């Protein structure tokens, strides 16, 4: 059976980076030629693995995390990077063995008028641990006095919106991103290439 990468790249609706989606792939055959045979992507670095030398390997599990970010934040989805997205939204471990894929989606993620469905966590007390996911919508407390569910001085709503406008520069245009994580523990490795 083929690994369902098509219901991850062909997804009509992607998720906000703060609540990045995660697919866990298992027990199937995956052709990583078709992914990187097509040059439809703008960014495709593979860390700790070669894409052409990936069809001969096997992994107990492969993880397909997907989200939408600003075009100039895609450089933050690499090992040991810092910023709003890497710090407070999606973190790649320093010892990362995987691939990062990204394509411009100024056609679907930037609507006439501006798209505000895509938020990112802009306020956090400390950094995510790698592959951590934080969905808290509590009023962020920057002061030494509680906020209790209402915005104001020292009280910031933590999620903010990208104002995705199609007329903006490419650095500010939505890029869809897929981060393939290849893991292997002492258990049956069921995700094999051909």
């Amino acid at each position, epitope marked *: 059976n083929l690994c369902p990468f098509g219901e991850v790249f062909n997804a009509t609706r992607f998720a906000s980076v703060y609540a990045w989606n995660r697919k866990r792939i298992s027990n199937c055959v995956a052709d990583y030629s078709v992914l990187y045979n097509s040059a439809s992507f703008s960014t495709f670095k593979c860390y700790g693995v070669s894409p052409t030398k990936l069809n001969d390997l096997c992994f107990t599990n492969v993880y397909a995390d997907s989200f939408v970010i600003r075009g100039d934040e895609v450089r933050q989805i690499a090992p040991g990077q*810092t*910023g*709003k997205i890497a*710090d*407070y939204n999606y973190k790649l471990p320093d010892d990362f063995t995987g691939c990062v894929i990204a394509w411009n989606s100024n056609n679907l993620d930037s609507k006439v008028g*501006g798209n*505000y469905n895509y938020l990112y966590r*802009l*306020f*956090r*007390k*400390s*950094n995510l641990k790698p592959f951590e996911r934080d969905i808290s919508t509590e009023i962020y*407390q*920057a*002061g*030494s006095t509680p906020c209790n569910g209402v915005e104001g*001085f*020292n009280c*910031y709503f933590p999620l*903010q919106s990208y*104002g995705f*406008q199609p*007329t*903006n*520069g490419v650095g*500010y245009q939505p890029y869809r991103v897929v981060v393939l994580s290849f893991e292997l523990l002492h258990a049956p490795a069921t995700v094999c290439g051909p």
Partner: antibody, heavy 117, light 109 residues
Framework: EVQLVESGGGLIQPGGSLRLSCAAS????????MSWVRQAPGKGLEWVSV???????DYAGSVKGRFTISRDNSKNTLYLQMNSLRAEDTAVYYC???????????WGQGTTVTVSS | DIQMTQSPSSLSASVGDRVTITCRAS??????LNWYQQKPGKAPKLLIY???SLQSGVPSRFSGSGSGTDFTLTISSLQPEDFATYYC??????????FGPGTKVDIKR
């Protein structure tokens, strides 16, 4: 007591160093983005370097490599270490808390930094 | 990056006049813009955050408007403590914000 009280600026020759100090009160620097802004005489506001709540820091190309933002959570003070100064760094330095979409609402009183041989 | 520009570099206005400063942006910032005021030898003061939200502690005559690339602070009735410089700042690429050059408002004569 919402206030940012800075100090530590003065007169220093080039290649020199200085440590600016933004003592905070009314907020917690540790859980806030804290920028350093400078304004050269009759020039205008220019960002210098920030420091997030996660300890990540970031600076502008002109000081990247010469400046260093930090903080001592216990004293609730924010600091800027200015090493290898140049004559293009002569400006008034302001410490602010950036509230992102809420704006830079709390500004410091400003400390002057003159770098001349 | 994002460039920010202000309509009139200088401006002459009378006490009781309705002043209108303008600010423009390289891209569609979509109301992520703040307005400040600065009198010589003092620090900036926030006036309007997020395009039109008035900042508590600021007089009711300060209006904030604009939504995409063209923006506008408006003082309804200029008063004697209103002669200062007003800059706009950008919240789109926070925490790396850029500012406008400023608009100096002075005493018409």
């Amino acid at each position: 007591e919402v206030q940012l009280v800075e100090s530590g600026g003065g007169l220093i020759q080039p290649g020199g160093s200085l440590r600016l100090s933004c003592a905070a009160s009314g907020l917690i620097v540790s859980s806030n983005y804290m920028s350093w802004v400078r304004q050269a005489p009759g020039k205008g506001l220019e960002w210098v370097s920030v420091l997030y709540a996660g300890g990540s820091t970031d600076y502008a190309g002109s000081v990247k490599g010469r400046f260093t933002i930090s903080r001592d959570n216990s004293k609730n003070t924010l600091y800027l270490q200015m090493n290898s100064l140049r004559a293009e760094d002569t400006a008034v330095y302001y410490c602010a808390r950036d509230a992102a979409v809420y704006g830079i609402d709390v500004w410091g009183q400003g400390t002057t930094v003159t770098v001349s041989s | 990056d994002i460039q920010m520009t202000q309509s009139p570099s200088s401006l002459s206005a009378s006490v009781g006049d309705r002043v209108t400063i303008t600010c423009r942006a390289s891209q569609s910032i979509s109301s992520y813009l703040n307005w400040y005021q600065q009198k010589p030898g003092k620090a900036p003061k926030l006036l309007i955050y997020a395009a039109s939200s008035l900042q508590s502690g600021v007089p009711s005559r300060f209006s904030g408007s604009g939504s995409g690339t063209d923006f506008t602070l408006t003082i309804s009735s200029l008063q004697p403590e209103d002669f200062a410089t007003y800059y706009c700042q950008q919240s789109y690429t926070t925490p790396l914000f850029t500012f406008g050059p400023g608009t100096k408002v002075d005493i018409k004569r």
